[PDB]
């Protein structure tokens, strides 16, 4: 098919609306212009990219402050293309006034240094001998892991290395705990994580100090942080990401019911074997007995 420029722009706009849809964006305001007609135009930039943004009167009504250059904002937007001139811009529907920039800036620094590579990751033992858990004494993760574990596989020794998993002093204690487990060396697989939460409280696991502790750790480490949709820097470094703390206990532990089904099935084969074994011997004797009877003079 040969595209005319008209049809080419239609396809791109239709594609962007379907695939992208509404998004949440943050950034810095620049070149704020306010047309007398009532609309609301500005540009959003970061240190390496920018995009044209527009907000209309019918949505610009509900703003509770006056933006200035250099302010940080959170925006709901729709991605669109002005067809006849090929302009790529987003339409805003909401606006309101630190950490998302840190997450991106820290990720790329570590990716280049190579801490995320597959070369340095170690396969998990199976069946595990002793599993260590680094989390709170009363955290939701600890109770959930212990109770799911008691169902699938009791008799597995579990050691809990305590430490706080919130507050600015949390990462220091986490690194001290991981080193204590490697040094003492009485366990084979290590679980570190916590329950769900907001980004303001998951920040402890995005520190560079903790990331360099999971890396350079002799024991394999499974990371189960937050709900199923939360990704942290510790997740990429760890040797296997478990979506939730419950799933972490699932990848480490065996299945009691499957073993029980195993021992039952092998008994059925053993019992059935004897029935066939006796019948063969019994029939062999039966025929030799019949021959004797028929030989009567």
């Amino acid at each position: 098919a040969i595209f005319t420029v008209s049809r080419l722009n239609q396809t791109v706009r239709l594609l962007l609306e379907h695939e992208m849809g509404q998004v949440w964006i943050s950034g810095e305001i620049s070149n704020f212009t306010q047309p007398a007609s009532g609309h609301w135009y500005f540009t959003l930039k970061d240190d390496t990219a920018q995009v044209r943004c527009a907000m209309f009167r019918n949505s610009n009504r509900r703003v509770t402050f006056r933006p200035q250059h250099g302010q940080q904002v959170l925006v709901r937007a729709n991605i669109t293309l002005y067809e006849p001139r090929g302009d790529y811009q987003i339409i805003v529907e909401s606006m309101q006034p630190l950490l998302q920039q840190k997450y991106e800036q820290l990720k790329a620094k570590l990716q280049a240094e190579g801490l995320f590579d597959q070369q340095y990751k170690k396969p998990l033992p199976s069946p595990a001998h002793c599993v260590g858990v680094i989390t709170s004494k009363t955290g939701a993760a600890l109770h959930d892991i212990l109770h799911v574990l008691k169902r699938r596989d009791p008799s597995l020794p579990v050691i809990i290395y305590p430490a706080a998993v919130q507050g600015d002093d949390a990462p220091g204690q986490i690194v001290r705990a991981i080193e204590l487990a490697n040094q003492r060396n009485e366990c084979d697989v290590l679980i570190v994580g916590r329950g769900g939460g907001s980004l303001e409280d998951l920040w402890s696991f995005n520190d560079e100090r903790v990331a360099r502790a999971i890396f350079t750790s002799r024991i394999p480490v499974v990371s189960a942080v937050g709900a199923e949709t939360d990704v942290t820097i510790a997740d990429f470094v760890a040797d296997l990401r478990a979506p939730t703390p419950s799933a972490a206990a699932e990848v480490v532990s065996r299945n009691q019911q499957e073993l029980l089904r195993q021992v039952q099935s092998t008994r059925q084969r053993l019992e059935m074997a004897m029935d066939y074994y006796l019948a063969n011997r019994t029939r062999r004797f039966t025929q030799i007995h019949h021959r004797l009877q028929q030989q009567h003079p």
Binding site: K137, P157, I159, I160, L260, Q262, T266, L270
Partner: protein, 54 residues
Amino acid sequence: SFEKALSELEQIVTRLESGDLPLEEALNEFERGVQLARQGQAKLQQAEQRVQIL
């Protein structure tokens, strides 16, 4: 040990399907097996959890 017992029980079956044993050996082997089977299953359901801190 469960895995040793499971593997050992597995060899009891294999001989019985070769069909070369005398009656007394077969019955002796059979009582070795089924006895070992119950012991294994009971031990699976008998253990419980242990945990300690620090």
